[PDB]
Design a protein around this ligand. Structure first.
Ligand code: 20A
Ligand code: ARS
Ligand code: ARS
Ligand code: ARS
Ligand code: MG
Ligand code: ZN
Length: 336
């Protein structure tokens, strides 16, 4: 069991100390990155898989796992401010927490659990730090490859699966042909659901499912077909992807500062190319604080309120924090 990726002996214990919070929403991934020589995705994934005995269940060699995860992490761009491996690590750890929510206890197969965490890990890999619309508008290589449809999300999936093609990195080698085929289907579905263009429809379908939810005697949601299970899973990874505003304010503020560095850099590229400036990427006019309030009001709260509704009362503290954080950003807007 690898205990460090660097030369700092103090980090071994510090890292292990942070990882005591592995199963908690309150885990601090920035600290994990700092104690792991900037290997938050490799280390958190190793921790999660060991926590869930997934290496044992799926006969994944520790060595193969580490090589794959190190190489996946290396395909996240460290020069992209937000969509780098720390984000992937966070979404994976957040998915790991949501999978254990009381309301979904015993609902998912081990293959489904494996699929969801893998999806989270790969879901933004090789992200260039500009939006689908920027790629489409600039007639980029990716947009031409993918015919303008879920351009980044198709690419993330292609890289993640392409990396499994080399023997030394094939973590799914000991799954059966049918298991591999089902996992690939689930992961594709989950990653494509992280395209924001799909959010309104995803939410509508989720609200719909919440309306007719059957909470069993013992308080567990009854999700008795695959169609139902994969719908909860796609919304789970989507929720994880959109979890920053539901974290402690200290964490949320750091995530905001990163996404704005990325967004404003896109805005600078648009200006540099004589393109029309995307209003919310324009550093000269856009309010960071208004943009968070609007993002919560219009996207994050409706989704989380609906998730919370689905897993009652598991997510109440998350909903509370989100509402607190929304209020903090609002109070940061100098006008009423
Ligand atoms: C730090 C918290 N966080 N996390 C994500 C995110 C975000 N958009 C992402 C873009 C990539 O796809 C998932 C959502 C955006 C973001 O999209 N901002 C623009 C915007 C869009 C609709 C409404 C208001 C504002 C803002 N904050 C974000
Ligand atoms: As580790
Ligand atoms: As490899
Ligand atoms: As923008
Ligand atoms: Mg993405
Ligand atoms: Zn993401």
């Amino acid at each position: 069991s690898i205990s460090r990726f660097g030369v700092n002996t103090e980090n071994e214990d510090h890292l292990a100390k942070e990882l005591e919070d592995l199963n908690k929403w309150g885990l601090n991934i920035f600290n994990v990155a700092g104690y792991s020589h900037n290997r938050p995705l490799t280390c958190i994934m190793y921790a999660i898989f060991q926590e869930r005995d997934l290496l044992k269940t799926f006969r994944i060699s520790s060595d193969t796992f580490i090589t794959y995860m190190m190489t996946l992490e290396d395909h996240y761009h460290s020069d992209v401010a937000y969509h780098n491996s720390l984000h992937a690590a966070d979404v994976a750890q957040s998915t790991h927490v949501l999978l254990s929510t009381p309301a979904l206890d015993a609902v998912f197969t081990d293959l489904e659990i494996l699929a969801a965490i893998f999806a989270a890990a790969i879901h933004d890999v090789d992200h260039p730090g500009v939006s689908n619309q920027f790629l489409i508008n600039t007639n980029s290589e990716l947009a031409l490859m993918y015919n303008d449809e879920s351009v980044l999300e198709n690419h993330h999936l292609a890289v993640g699966f392409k990396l499994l093609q080399e023997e030394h990195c094939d973590i799914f080698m000991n799954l059966t042909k049918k298991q591999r085929q089902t996992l690939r289907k689930m992961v594709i579905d989950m990653v494509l659901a992280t395209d924001m263009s799909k959010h309104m429809s995803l939410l509508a379908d989720l609200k719909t499912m919440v309306e007719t939810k059957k909470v069993t005697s013992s308080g567990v949601l009854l999700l008795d077909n695959y169609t139902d299970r994969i719908q909860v899973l796609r919304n789970m990874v989507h929720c994880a992807d959109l979890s920053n505003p539901t974290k402690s304010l200290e964490l949320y503020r750091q995530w905001t500062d990163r996404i704005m560095e990325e967004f404003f850099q896109q805005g600078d590229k648009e200006r540099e190319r004589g393109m029309e400036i995307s209003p919310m990427c324009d550093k000269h006019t856009a309010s960071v604080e208004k943009s968070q309030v609007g993002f919560i009001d219009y996207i994050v709260h409706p989704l989380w309120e609906t998730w919370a509704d689905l897993v009652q009362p598991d997510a109440q503290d998350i909903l509370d924090t989100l509402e607190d954080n929304r209020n903090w950003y609002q109070a940061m807007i100098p006008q009423a």
